[PDB]
Amino acid sequence: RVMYYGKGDVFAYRTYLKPLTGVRTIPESPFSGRDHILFGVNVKISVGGTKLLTSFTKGDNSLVVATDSMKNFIQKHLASYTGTTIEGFLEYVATSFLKKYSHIEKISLIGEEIPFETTFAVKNGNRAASELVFKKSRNEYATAYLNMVRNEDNTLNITEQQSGLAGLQLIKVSGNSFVGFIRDEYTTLPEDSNRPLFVYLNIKWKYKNTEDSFGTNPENYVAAEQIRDIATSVFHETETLSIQHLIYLIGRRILERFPQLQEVYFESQNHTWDKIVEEIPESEGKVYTEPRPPYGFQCFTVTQED
Amino acid sequence: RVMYYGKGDVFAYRTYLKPLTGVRTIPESPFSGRDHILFGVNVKISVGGTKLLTSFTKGDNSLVVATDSMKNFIQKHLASYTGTTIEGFLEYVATSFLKKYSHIEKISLIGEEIPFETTFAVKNGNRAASELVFKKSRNEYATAYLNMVRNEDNTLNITEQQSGLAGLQLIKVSGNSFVGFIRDEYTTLPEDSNRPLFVYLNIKWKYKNTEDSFGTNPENYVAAEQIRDIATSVFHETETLSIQHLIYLIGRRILERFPQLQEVYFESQNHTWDKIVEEIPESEGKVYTEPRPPYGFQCFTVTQED
Amino acid sequence: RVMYYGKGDVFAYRTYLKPLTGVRTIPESPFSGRDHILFGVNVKISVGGTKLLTSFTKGDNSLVVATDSMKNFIQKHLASYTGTTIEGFLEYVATSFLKKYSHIEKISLIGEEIPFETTFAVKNGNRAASELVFKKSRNEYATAYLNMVRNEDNTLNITEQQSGLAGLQLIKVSGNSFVGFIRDEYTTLPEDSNRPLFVYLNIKWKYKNTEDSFGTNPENYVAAEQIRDIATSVFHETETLSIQHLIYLIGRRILERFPQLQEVYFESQNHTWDKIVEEIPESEGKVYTEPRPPYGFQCFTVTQED
Amino acid sequence: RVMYYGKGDVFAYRTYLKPLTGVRTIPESPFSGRDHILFGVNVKISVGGTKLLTSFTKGDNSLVVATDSMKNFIQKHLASYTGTTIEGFLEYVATSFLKKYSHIEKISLIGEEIPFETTFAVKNGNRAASELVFKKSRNEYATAYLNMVRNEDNTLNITEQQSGLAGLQLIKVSGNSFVGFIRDEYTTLPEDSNRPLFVYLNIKWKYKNTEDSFGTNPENYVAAEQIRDIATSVFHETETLSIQHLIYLIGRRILERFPQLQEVYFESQNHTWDKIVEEIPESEGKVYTEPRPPYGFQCFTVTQED
């Protein structure tokens, strides 16, 4: 039976987490690590267990870890966390939670980065990156997901792990087509040999070996910042034939750069602008505007078997 | 393998849909039907099929029904729909879509009501409900979900059906408790014999018999308005011991009132206020304020096995 | 020079406020008062004064009332408030603040109602209105604005008072036209003798006598619920020729029903739907959908001179 | 009498606008211009004038320019614009509109940048800035405001002009204090000699000479990007004693760098996190979390005369 409870929107901000170093650059991305002067995370915790049943059926709170207590638990654990990644932070919380509370059989954790970008400051006359001042970003952010279970024989196993990148909004001004689609009684969409493809991208990847996701050995760790740069680079390089076409080629490229990954999952959305003006005198430019609310979307998983 | 595409946020508004009448009443609710002078729905459509593979791998759009064409299909079918429910509308769209498109093997549909409330006007000497003017509501709304597949032998079969009520936000000012929970090093929440419990509720039900969702026989239909009325009534009658405790009781009342239902599912959130002032002289009143963002949540399925 | 500081989003919820009764009724509305079992308010406070200067220019906080302390002030005063309206609560907060902090020369307050709607419960055999369970509403809400100054001779004076209704969203399915507008090289909008006019309305009114706003003499108070009912009634009654034409008619009706009002200010928007389908066989019905983002807006003040 | 009408959320995206080049650099910023490969803007247009009266009072649309036509006018004008700034674009629209429609006495325009960021693409062997693929940013954006009147002698005069930068969210991890403020019965906030000051900033500036805002002479133009960089630099450099003290010093630096500016206006908000963990073993690190909803705010003008 379905039976879970927990805490969502657990925001937790940590200064001076152990820096993530030793990630090898790939051609698409300069990412080599994170300074972690500021490390923000938004945690959602959810726990399950057959012994929680009376809390529902009888109003018996004896075996109820208050959700407020779970919040305290996550926040103290971020203080005491000695690792370098969100993925590793989740495992640390999950392990430590299951050991503390034996009546809990399953725990599920989501960790969403709260990204901060660097800013410019002048020190004694010269402009450079600040080590004190940071700009909160509302753009793309890394994610992580972990499900941990307590088996009958009293051991703890990770049953599901998934890392990700969310809120990536990319527009390519030209070099995009959508042609040859079904033309029938329901079709009003004109063919377009040259559109400004505007796509929202949620990319998720699973590791062949779960240990690689924690960052303990950084050479095996796949950073969301790297996945971002692959997506932009592939979009640039491709004469896209559709979004479906685009995300296949993005996923192929990710799995080629990262042979430690089993699969790459995509959730895309089409928010492409409507054309108002085709031609301006003496320039190559055009004018576009926002479309009606309806948006296209695609879901697609690319495995190593492709 | 995971392979889907479609269209979201398909808003469609129909005037003068066939009225919902002939429903079976229950003690908790005076719900007697819907006028359907104004019928609003927000439709998400997703389709799959192995024959779509090459639209991704090769960028071959030959068998691609444009997502924009899916929008036209939905809107046109809301015009020609002869029934009386969202659930029934989904089945009309799904069956019709698969019949039109032989290479599509599965279709999933979500439909979310866009509620409107009655307003009143003075005309002809008296104040009376307006047949023309309606107020858009951003409160609770009904939902529907339907998954339909094309089988090997070319029949169409519904594999999943679920109806629902979303966005229900209820506060009970007194007559609630949360005591007896685990007290340890992680616990800073005080025991509370009398709190103003504030809950967000999303409730979803499944029928034993799928045909009962359509409203063709209105007696067997379960209206979201009736479910709303059960929830608010049970909340009032109950000396709550927790949210877990409350949603079980709601779930049981729903299953008792509707024997044609197989199960009920809850997704609740806790948004209870913090107390600022406990005692006002010459008054039973108190002052409260908004809490920090972390919210408690609870997921639970009550089945006929209760 | 502009110099202010303060606190916003000061949420405060009070139970068992003194009920608003003894109101004077109008034909358009059955509004007879407020129970005030649950009273919710969202306050924003701004304060000024030339003596706050050094807190900006020198970093001198000696005369700085902490914005956190302002939040505590408002929340404690909601507990001690013996009145019946948001407008009267603002006066009480304002007067009390300037009396406490002599160095402050001006104070501006905004109060927004946090709506709650009656729910129903089965109890003791019958189905009746609950005194405990309330539904949070995200629809229309009352507002209040007050600006108070400390005069050079130490007395206090209200320089501005303004009450309001916000978030009112109304659609009239028929009996609306928009024709006769300018047709030139920038005009693509077709003339329309029968459209479904959808408006967002923000209505604000000022009293001739400030003290009528407080609700001390309730018969003189103009309730936002009554304004709402006038708006829906006039929209229904009127074959509108534009939104412009409609809001003038609502404003005139307001000033006729409430002669103690000086003026009524409107801030409207046009979110009218796009027609998809005109003809549905054997029914007067039609289908519509959401337009592109650009919305029309209108600003108009009606005074006793009309 | 208040009498206005127009169109909001006019989204307009132009490709290959004339590049902004030759901007006078400052030490705090690298900014030297904009490529304008992609240029997005969100315009709100408002028009007024006494001959519109009958449009409201009688429902006579003879002199009504449809708001939909205003949208067309703005969009078509983005195509024909030969200038290089948002401020210049508003002037071009305003002037052109008043010349075309002689019954209109006044026009007010708001222009909001829709910012796009550069991305990485593998080009000519190594990753470099793509000239095709951009990332939509939901962070800070440039703004502009222009009001223009037709005088009785039929000349067109700019009566108000203001440029801006909105949505800047800055957090400084240390080097911030808030002490010495008033401590009475309403004060619960502890003094803090070391807090992680988190500020939301809206900065607006007016020019001594209006013609400096258009960018026709790029030597005299003040770019939002440069203002952005002055703000992060000054925040870094300053041991802040309050937000009030911070924004004053930010303003001074702006007026010093830009003698062609008459004034700088600030609207700031305090969203500073609550401390959970003050001390972590073997580390200078700390953990924080989101506070309750209430937020402090400051409004302040710095002029050349400070």
Ligand SMILES: O=c1[nH]c(=O)c2nn[nH]c2[nH]1
């Ligand atoms: O109803 C509740 N259930 C819980 O699990 C919980 N935890 N803190 N408060 C709570 N309230």
Ligand SMILES: O=c1[nH]c(=O)c2nn[nH]c2[nH]1
């Ligand atoms: O890339 C696209 N894929 C689709 O399936 C589609 N339908 N309309 N536009 C589209 N673009």
Ligand SMILES: O=c1[nH]c(=O)c2nn[nH]c2[nH]1
């Ligand atoms: O009622 C309206 N007034 C207007 O000014 C307008 N412009 N487009 N549609 C409109 N409708």
Ligand SMILES: O=c1[nH]c(=O)c2nn[nH]c2[nH]1
């Ligand atoms: O910078 C600040 N200014 C203020 O006025 C204030 N009040 N609380 N914290 C504050 N911080």
